mmCIF file of all heavy atoms in Angstrom:
data_model
loop_
_atom_site.group_PDB
_atom_site.id
_atom_site.type_symbol
_atom_site.label_atom_id
_atom_site.label_comp_id
_atom_site.label_asym_id
_atom_site.label_seq_id
_atom_site.Cartn_x
_atom_site.Cartn_y
_atom_site.Cartn_z
ATOM 1 N N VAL A 36 108.114 109.137 113.728
ATOM 2 C CA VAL A 36 108.974 109.120 112.511
ATOM 3 C C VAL A 36 108.676 110.358 111.663
ATOM 4 O O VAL A 36 107.530 110.539 111.214
ATOM 5 C CB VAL A 36 108.777 107.822 111.720
ATOM 6 C CG1 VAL A 36 109.531 107.873 110.405
ATOM 7 C CG2 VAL A 36 109.147 106.601 112.567
ATOM 8 N N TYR A 37 109.721 111.114 111.375
ATOM 9 C CA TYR A 37 109.706 112.334 110.544
ATOM 10 C C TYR A 37 110.244 111.954 109.163
ATOM 11 O O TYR A 37 111.313 111.331 109.092
ATOM 12 C CB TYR A 37 110.603 113.389 111.186
ATOM 13 C CG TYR A 37 110.220 113.773 112.595
ATOM 14 C CD1 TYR A 37 110.672 113.030 113.674
ATOM 15 C CD2 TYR A 37 109.454 114.897 112.855
ATOM 16 C CE1 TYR A 37 110.307 113.349 114.978
ATOM 17 C CE2 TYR A 37 109.125 115.262 114.160
ATOM 18 C CZ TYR A 37 109.518 114.461 115.217
ATOM 19 O OH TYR A 37 109.172 114.776 116.503
ATOM 20 N N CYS A 38 109.540 112.327 108.104
ATOM 21 C CA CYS A 38 110.015 112.071 106.719
ATOM 22 C C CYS A 38 109.467 113.128 105.775
ATOM 23 O O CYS A 38 108.525 113.852 106.103
ATOM 24 C CB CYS A 38 109.696 110.661 106.280
ATOM 25 S SG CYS A 38 107.951 110.381 105.869
ATOM 26 N N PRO A 39 110.059 113.300 104.576
ATOM 27 C CA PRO A 39 109.516 114.263 103.631
ATOM 28 C C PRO A 39 108.090 113.861 103.238
ATOM 29 O O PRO A 39 107.781 112.702 103.024
ATOM 30 C CB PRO A 39 110.499 114.196 102.452
ATOM 31 C CG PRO A 39 111.786 113.708 103.087
ATOM 32 C CD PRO A 39 111.304 112.674 104.091
ATOM 33 N N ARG A 40 107.233 114.848 103.090
ATOM 34 C CA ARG A 40 105.805 114.569 102.829
ATOM 35 C C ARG A 40 105.628 114.010 101.413
ATOM 36 O O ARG A 40 104.604 113.358 101.200
ATOM 37 C CB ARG A 40 104.967 115.825 103.085
ATOM 38 C CG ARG A 40 105.148 116.927 102.057
ATOM 39 C CD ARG A 40 104.246 118.086 102.371
ATOM 40 N NE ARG A 40 104.526 119.262 101.591
ATOM 41 C CZ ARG A 40 103.724 120.317 101.509
ATOM 42 N NH1 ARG A 40 102.575 120.362 102.183
ATOM 43 N NH2 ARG A 40 104.077 121.331 100.745
ATOM 44 N N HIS A 41 106.587 114.156 100.479
ATOM 45 C CA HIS A 41 106.377 113.650 99.097
ATOM 46 C C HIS A 41 106.498 112.135 99.031
ATOM 47 O O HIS A 41 106.316 111.614 97.936
ATOM 48 C CB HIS A 41 107.206 114.381 98.037
ATOM 49 C CG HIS A 41 108.681 114.190 98.153
ATOM 50 N ND1 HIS A 41 109.486 115.112 98.798
ATOM 51 C CD2 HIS A 41 109.499 113.238 97.657
ATOM 52 C CE1 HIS A 41 110.755 114.714 98.702
ATOM 53 N NE2 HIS A 41 110.784 113.569 98.001
ATOM 54 N N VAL A 42 106.732 111.455 100.160
ATOM 55 C CA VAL A 42 106.583 109.978 100.226
ATOM 56 C C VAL A 42 105.177 109.559 99.746
ATOM 57 O O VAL A 42 105.091 108.435 99.192
ATOM 58 C CB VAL A 42 106.899 109.419 101.623
ATOM 59 C CG1 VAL A 42 105.778 109.676 102.633
ATOM 60 C CG2 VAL A 42 107.222 107.937 101.573
ATOM 61 N N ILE A 43 104.148 110.419 99.870
ATOM 62 C CA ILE A 43 102.724 110.060 99.532
ATOM 63 C C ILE A 43 102.438 110.365 98.055
ATOM 64 O O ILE A 43 101.311 110.102 97.617
ATOM 65 C CB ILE A 43 101.715 110.778 100.451
ATOM 66 C CG1 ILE A 43 101.606 112.279 100.142
ATOM 67 C CG2 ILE A 43 102.023 110.516 101.919
ATOM 68 C CD1 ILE A 43 100.791 113.102 101.143
ATOM 69 N N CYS A 44 103.436 110.792 97.287
ATOM 70 C CA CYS A 44 103.311 111.146 95.844
ATOM 71 C C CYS A 44 103.751 110.010 94.930
ATOM 72 O O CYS A 44 104.778 109.392 95.236
ATOM 73 C CB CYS A 44 104.182 112.337 95.493
ATOM 74 S SG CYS A 44 103.584 113.847 96.268
ATOM 75 N N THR A 45 103.025 109.803 93.827
ATOM 76 C CA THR A 45 103.548 109.091 92.636
ATOM 77 C C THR A 45 104.450 110.070 91.880
ATOM 78 O O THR A 45 104.432 111.259 92.215
ATOM 79 C CB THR A 45 102.439 108.638 91.689
ATOM 80 O OG1 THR A 45 101.883 109.859 91.203
ATOM 81 C CG2 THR A 45 101.386 107.785 92.355
ATOM 82 N N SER A 46 105.187 109.608 90.871
ATOM 83 C CA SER A 46 106.048 110.482 90.024
ATOM 84 C C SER A 46 105.241 111.646 89.424
ATOM 85 O O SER A 46 105.760 112.770 89.520
ATOM 86 C CB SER A 46 106.760 109.695 88.963
ATOM 87 O OG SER A 46 107.503 108.637 89.561
ATOM 88 N N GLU A 47 104.043 111.405 88.856
ATOM 89 C CA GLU A 47 103.189 112.453 88.215
ATOM 90 C C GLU A 47 102.713 113.462 89.260
ATOM 91 O O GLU A 47 102.794 114.675 88.998
ATOM 92 C CB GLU A 47 101.911 111.924 87.557
ATOM 93 C CG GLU A 47 102.134 110.879 86.480
ATOM 94 C CD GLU A 47 101.806 109.470 86.943
ATOM 95 O OE1 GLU A 47 102.138 109.141 88.110
ATOM 96 O OE2 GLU A 47 101.213 108.708 86.144
ATOM 97 N N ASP A 48 102.237 112.992 90.411
ATOM 98 C CA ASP A 48 101.798 113.877 91.519
ATOM 99 C C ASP A 48 102.822 114.991 91.721
ATOM 100 O O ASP A 48 102.386 116.120 91.982
ATOM 101 C CB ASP A 48 101.651 113.100 92.829
ATOM 102 C CG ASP A 48 100.462 112.162 92.835
ATOM 103 O OD1 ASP A 48 99.474 112.445 92.096
ATOM 104 O OD2 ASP A 48 100.542 111.146 93.546
ATOM 105 N N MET A 49 104.122 114.669 91.582
ATOM 106 C CA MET A 49 105.277 115.540 91.967
ATOM 107 C C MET A 49 105.296 116.813 91.115
ATOM 108 O O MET A 49 105.834 117.829 91.577
ATOM 109 C CB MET A 49 106.640 114.848 91.791
ATOM 110 C CG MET A 49 106.745 113.452 92.380
ATOM 111 S SD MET A 49 107.584 113.360 93.976
ATOM 112 C CE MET A 49 107.539 111.591 94.272
ATOM 113 N N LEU A 50 104.726 116.796 89.916
ATOM 114 C CA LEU A 50 104.714 118.003 89.043
ATOM 115 C C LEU A 50 103.893 119.131 89.685
ATOM 116 O O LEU A 50 104.260 120.286 89.514
ATOM 117 C CB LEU A 50 104.203 117.618 87.651
ATOM 118 C CG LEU A 50 104.863 116.361 87.063
ATOM 119 C CD1 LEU A 50 104.107 115.868 85.842
ATOM 120 C CD2 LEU A 50 106.335 116.613 86.734
ATOM 121 N N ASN A 51 102.840 118.813 90.445
ATOM 122 C CA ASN A 51 101.944 119.836 91.058
ATOM 123 C C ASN A 51 101.102 119.175 92.139
ATOM 124 O O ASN A 51 99.890 119.064 92.012
ATOM 125 C CB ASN A 51 101.039 120.506 90.030
ATOM 126 C CG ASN A 51 100.305 121.700 90.598
ATOM 127 O OD1 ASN A 51 100.697 122.282 91.605
ATOM 128 N ND2 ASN A 51 99.246 122.095 89.926
ATOM 129 N N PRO A 52 101.739 118.690 93.219
ATOM 130 C CA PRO A 52 101.036 117.877 94.218
ATOM 131 C C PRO A 52 100.046 118.664 95.083
ATOM 132 O O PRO A 52 100.377 119.747 95.505
ATOM 133 C CB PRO A 52 102.172 117.352 95.112
ATOM 134 C CG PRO A 52 103.286 118.382 94.953
ATOM 135 C CD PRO A 52 103.169 118.898 93.533
ATOM 136 N N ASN A 53 98.862 118.092 95.331
ATOM 137 C CA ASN A 53 97.943 118.581 96.396
ATOM 138 C C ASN A 53 98.129 117.635 97.586
ATOM 139 O O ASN A 53 97.472 116.570 97.612
ATOM 140 C CB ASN A 53 96.471 118.652 95.971
ATOM 141 C CG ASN A 53 95.598 119.466 96.914
ATOM 142 O OD1 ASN A 53 94.527 119.902 96.499
ATOM 143 N ND2 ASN A 53 96.033 119.734 98.144
ATOM 144 N N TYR A 54 99.050 117.989 98.472
ATOM 145 C CA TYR A 54 99.542 117.091 99.547
ATOM 146 C C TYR A 54 98.348 116.713 100.451
ATOM 147 O O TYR A 54 98.222 115.529 100.844
ATOM 148 C CB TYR A 54 100.723 117.749 100.248
ATOM 149 C CG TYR A 54 102.030 117.662 99.481
ATOM 150 C CD1 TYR A 54 102.610 118.790 98.931
ATOM 151 C CD2 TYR A 54 102.670 116.448 99.267
ATOM 152 C CE1 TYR A 54 103.799 118.732 98.216
ATOM 153 C CE2 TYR A 54 103.870 116.368 98.572
ATOM 154 C CZ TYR A 54 104.432 117.514 98.021
ATOM 155 O OH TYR A 54 105.615 117.467 97.312
ATOM 156 N N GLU A 55 97.439 117.657 100.684
ATOM 157 C CA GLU A 55 96.252 117.448 101.557
ATOM 158 C C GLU A 55 95.289 116.457 100.912
ATOM 159 O O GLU A 55 94.864 115.516 101.609
ATOM 160 C CB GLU A 55 95.543 118.762 101.852
ATOM 161 C CG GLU A 55 96.307 119.647 102.802
ATOM 162 C CD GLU A 55 97.374 120.510 102.164
ATOM 163 O OE1 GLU A 55 97.636 120.336 100.952
ATOM 164 O OE2 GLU A 55 97.947 121.350 102.877
ATOM 165 N N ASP A 56 94.948 116.636 99.643
ATOM 166 C CA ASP A 56 94.087 115.674 98.910
ATOM 167 C C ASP A 56 94.747 114.294 98.950
ATOM 168 O O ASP A 56 93.998 113.286 99.021
ATOM 169 C CB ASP A 56 93.841 116.104 97.467
ATOM 170 C CG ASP A 56 92.991 115.132 96.681
ATOM 171 O OD1 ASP A 56 91.754 115.205 96.829
ATOM 172 O OD2 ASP A 56 93.565 114.290 95.952
ATOM 173 N N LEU A 57 96.090 114.233 98.887
ATOM 174 C CA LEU A 57 96.805 112.929 98.785
ATOM 175 C C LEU A 57 96.805 112.280 100.178
ATOM 176 O O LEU A 57 96.574 111.081 100.246
ATOM 177 C CB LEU A 57 98.239 113.109 98.254
ATOM 178 C CG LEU A 57 98.389 113.524 96.784
ATOM 179 C CD1 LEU A 57 99.846 113.737 96.434
ATOM 180 C CD2 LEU A 57 97.792 112.515 95.818
ATOM 181 N N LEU A 58 97.087 113.043 101.234
ATOM 182 C CA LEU A 58 97.198 112.525 102.618
ATOM 183 C C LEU A 58 95.810 112.126 103.128
ATOM 184 O O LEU A 58 95.740 111.275 104.027
ATOM 185 C CB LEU A 58 97.826 113.582 103.527
ATOM 186 C CG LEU A 58 98.158 113.086 104.927
ATOM 187 C CD1 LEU A 58 99.047 111.838 104.874
ATOM 188 C CD2 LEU A 58 98.790 114.181 105.765
ATOM 189 N N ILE A 59 94.756 112.725 102.571
ATOM 190 C CA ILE A 59 93.341 112.492 102.981
ATOM 191 C C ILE A 59 93.002 111.033 102.668
ATOM 192 O O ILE A 59 92.350 110.419 103.512
ATOM 193 C CB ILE A 59 92.412 113.519 102.289
ATOM 194 C CG1 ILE A 59 91.736 114.440 103.304
ATOM 195 C CG2 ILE A 59 91.426 112.866 101.329
ATOM 196 C CD1 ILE A 59 92.689 115.425 103.957
#
């Protein structure tokens, strides 16, 4: 399953997300 990576973000995360810290 392929999806946008911002599925792992809350609304606040979205302002300046560290996708790696979040996916970890």
